[PDB]
Design a protein around this ligand. Structure first.
Ligand SMILES: [Zn+2]
Ligand SMILES: [Zn+2]
Lengths: 49, 97, 111, 86, 51
């Protein structure tokens, strides 16, 4: 179960990376695209852990 | 984990790698054991934590000493007022109660 | 942009002649003056994008640190290329990548 | 006598400094040189290595455990501990 | 691979005193004249004729 959760989280991170690399990532207000991407990735990894 | 090298955290990763393992995600547990990249990233995090604690304790000590020096001579009198050494009233009643 | 002096090898500056009502370029390291063909004197735009590919080289193919993709090249239809993000380090730089093919030695985008 | 210098001069082991490491690709282990095609929960999880279709390695680490110093080389299983404890 | 990541002195010396990795080495120093000769032999062009 833990391995499945970690793999699903990694797939979600890959999807976020793909969305960001094609300018298809929603921009949080008052903050740039790169830090928004980093925050989303960090939130996903923290939720996975 | 920042890109210490040229656009890569470690020489063992290709340039522009944003995968979780590339920037400091440790999938394995302590029981399983850490891969060398995860070991190095964990060491970096531990060193940063040690430095932060070492500076925070000194800052808190200085603040506490200054605060003690500021309020050294405040004492509640027999009439319920709270006055300094000069006799100036700080509070007409300690804690308003 | 700007021109150099033809014999002074010095910096040319714009000025006006009012006996003719015209704009010329003159050098006070000399006495030469030449006809300015453009009334434009100064440019400034707050939104800038140039600096995306930056210093690409024909030798980028033999770089081992760059990741190698399997994208189909547009005109030569090769299935081997490298990719890298924009070289501009501005805070709001996009994360879109540039793909350089190892066969035809040219770059292309992901559109 | 055939020794370490013989290995170096034969072109199989070379010295790299910090600034040269910017321009090379290093593999952790010889097993990483050859890509495989398992499913055991006891062993640790190696990096996926899926960003690139193929990898062009230029150097391989002799052994990762050599990144430690003299003092840290005494710790048994340092990879199973928290770094402040080490 | 150059300094030990695990070890560092505790206190004010943390991060300032390091120990080398178990395979690290220090360069002794070599004359640069053979390098210049090798470069000049292999088609290197000086700065004097550089446009
Ligand atoms: Zn002139
Ligand atoms: Zn092509």
């Amino acid at each position: 179960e833990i391995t499945h959760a970690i793999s699903s989280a990694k797939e979600q991170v890959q999807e976020i990376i793909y969305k960001a690399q094609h300018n298809e990532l929603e921009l949080k207000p008052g903050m740039t695209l790169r830090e928004s991407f980093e925050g989303e990735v960090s939130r996903t990894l923290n939720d996975a852990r | 984990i920042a890109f210490g090298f040229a656009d890569r955290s470690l020489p063992h990763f290709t340039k522009d790698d944003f995968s979780p393992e590339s920037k400091g995600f440790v999938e394995n547990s302590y029981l399983r054991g850490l891969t060398p990249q995860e070991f190095f990233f964990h060491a970096m995090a531990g060193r940063e934590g040690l430095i932060d604690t070492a500076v925070k304790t000194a800052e808190t000590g200085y603040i506490q000493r200054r605060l003690v020096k500021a309020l050294e001579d405040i004492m509640v009198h027999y009439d319920g007022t709270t006055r300094n050494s000069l006799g100036d009233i700080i509070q007409f009643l300690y804690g308003e109660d | 942009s700007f021109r150099f002096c033809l014999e002074c090898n010095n910096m040319l500056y714009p000025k006006e002649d009012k006996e003719n009502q015209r704009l010329l370029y003159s050098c006070r390291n000399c006495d030469y003056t030449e006809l300015a063909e453009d009334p434009k004197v100064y440019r400034h735009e707050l939104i800038t994008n140039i600096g995306e590919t930056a210093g690409i080289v024909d030798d980028i193919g033999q770089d081992p640190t760059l990741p190698r993709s399997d994208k189909e090249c547009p005109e030569c239809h090769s299935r081997d290329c490298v990719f890298f993000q924009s070289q501009q380090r501005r805070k709001d730089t996009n994360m879109t990548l540039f793909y350089v093919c190892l066969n035809c030695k040219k770059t292309f985008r992901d559109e | 006598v055939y020794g370490w210098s013989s290995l170096v001069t034969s072109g199989v082991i070379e010295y790299v400094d910090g600034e040269e490491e910017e321009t090379i690709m290093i593999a952790m282990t010889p097993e990483d040189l050859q890509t495989r095609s398992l499913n055991d929960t006891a062993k640790r999880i190696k990096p996926e290595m899926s960003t690139s279709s193929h990898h062009t390695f230029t150097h391989c680490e002799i052994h990762p455990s050599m990144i430690l110093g003299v003092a840290a080389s005494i710790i048994p299983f340092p990879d199973h501990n928290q770094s402040p404890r080490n | 691979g150059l300094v030990c990541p695990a070890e560092t002195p505790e206190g004010q010396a943390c991060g300032l005193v390091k120990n080398l990795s178990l395979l690290s080495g220090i360069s002794i120093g070599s004359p640069s004249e053979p390098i210049i000769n090798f470069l000049e032999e292999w088609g290197m062009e000086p700065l004097e004729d550089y446009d």
